[PDB]
Amino acid sequence: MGRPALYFCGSIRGGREDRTLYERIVSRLRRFGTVLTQHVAAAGDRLIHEQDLEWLQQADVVVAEVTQPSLGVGYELGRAVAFNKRILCLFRPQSGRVLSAMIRGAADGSRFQVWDYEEGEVEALLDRYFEA
Amino acid sequence: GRPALYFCGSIRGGREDRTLYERIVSRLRRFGTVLTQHVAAAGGDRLIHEQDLEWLQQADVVVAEVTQPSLGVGYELGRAVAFNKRILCLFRPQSGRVLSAMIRGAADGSRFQVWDYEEGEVEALLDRYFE
Ligand SMILES: *[C@@H]1C[C@H](O)[C@@H](COP(=O)(O)O)O1
Ligand SMILES: *[C@@H]1C[C@H](O)[C@@H](COP(=O)(O)O)O1
């Protein structure tokens, strides 16, 4: 509790297409606090559910990369909204996808923000959000 | 008309299973009023979010087909759990996918149930759930 707790979410069983980007995000988040996340660099379901729920409640900020569709990321964002968490979502329009209306439409520009970004930009945008 | 039955399934995550969603929605109509975005373009997404949240809050039972990964379906299920809704999830293992741990691990066998099924079983299973 001596540093901010930053909870990172991104697709796993939805697909690990963006795993490298997730590691880039996590690595940068470590500059701004303790990172709580299921994601581990390449280098039971009830327990997985309960641990991520535990991390989520501990979180001061929830950071989600929402480009790859994922039930778990969506579920974690829904639980996070119900917990009144500050939320930042990061989405890549160049993927060719249209972001879920439930995520884009949940944005209010303050406590729930959805930022579009392109390859090469995410570290700069994280610096902006966390006030480097 | 009650019960109100809220159906969720992938849309912008992919419409791979849209025909199965229609089969599910058609069978749900036998047991209650069906509230769903599904019917057989961003820029106004706030209105979509608010409308599905409205339907979810009115729902007596939430039915989700969770085979195709979807942020919206997952988000709706997360909000549904926070609302302490009765939830039924339906998953097809023959899809070759491993269902999200956040959905499978949310199950408690009563208020939150996850049923595996195969093509051709979904109507019988819905009949069974809704008595
Ligand atoms: C909670 C942590 C992680 O971000 C998310 C992964 O969900 P999947 O359904 O496995 O993609 O769950
Ligand atoms: C709310 C209703 C529907 O089941 C779900 C679809 O989400 P997508 O992110 O568009 O797949 O959203």
Author numbering:
A (entry chain A): 18 to 60, 72 to 160
B (entry chain B): 19 to 58, 69 to 159
Quoted passage from the original study:
To visualise the trapping of the glycosyl-enzyme intermediate, we employed a crystallisation construct harbouring a single E55Q point mutation. Purified DNPH1E55Q protein was co-crystallised with hmdUMP and the structure solved in space group P212121 at 1.65 Å resolution using the DNPH1E104Q structure for molecular replacement. In the crystal structure a biologically active homodimer comprises the asymmetric unit, and both active sites contain a trapped glycosyl-enzyme intermediate with deoxyribose monophosphate (dRP) covalently fused to E104. However, in both chains, the dRP:E104 moiety adopts two distinct, alternative conformations, one of which permits an additional interaction between the constituent sugar and surrounding sidechains. The base of the substrate has been cleaved and is no longer visible, but has been largely replaced by a well-defined water network. This network is stabilised in part by E55Q, which is now presented into the active site through reorganisation of the helical element harbouring the LTEHV motif. Consequently, H56 tucks away below the anomeric carbon. Remarkably, E55Q appears to be ideally positioned although, due to the mutation, chemically unable to activate one of the bound waters for nucleophilic attack at the anomeric carbon, in agreement with activity assays. Crucially, the conserved catalytic aspartate (D80) is too far away to perform this activation, and the active site arrangement indicates that this is also the case in the wild-type enzyme. In this dominant arrangement, H56 electrostatically drives the dRP 3′ hydroxyl group to form a hydrogen bond with the remaining sidechain carbonyl oxygen of E104.
The cellular role of DNPH1 is to remove hydroxymethyl deoxyuridine monophosphate (hmdUMP) from the nucleotide pool. Hydrolysis generates deoxyribose monophosphate (dRP) and hydroxymethyl uracil (hmU) products. Glycosidic bond cleavage is driven by a conserved catalytic triad and proceeds via a two-step mechanism involving formation and subsequent disruption of a covalent glycosyl-enzyme intermediate. Each DNPH1 monomer adopts a Rossmann-like fold consisting of five core β-strands surrounded by five major α-helices.
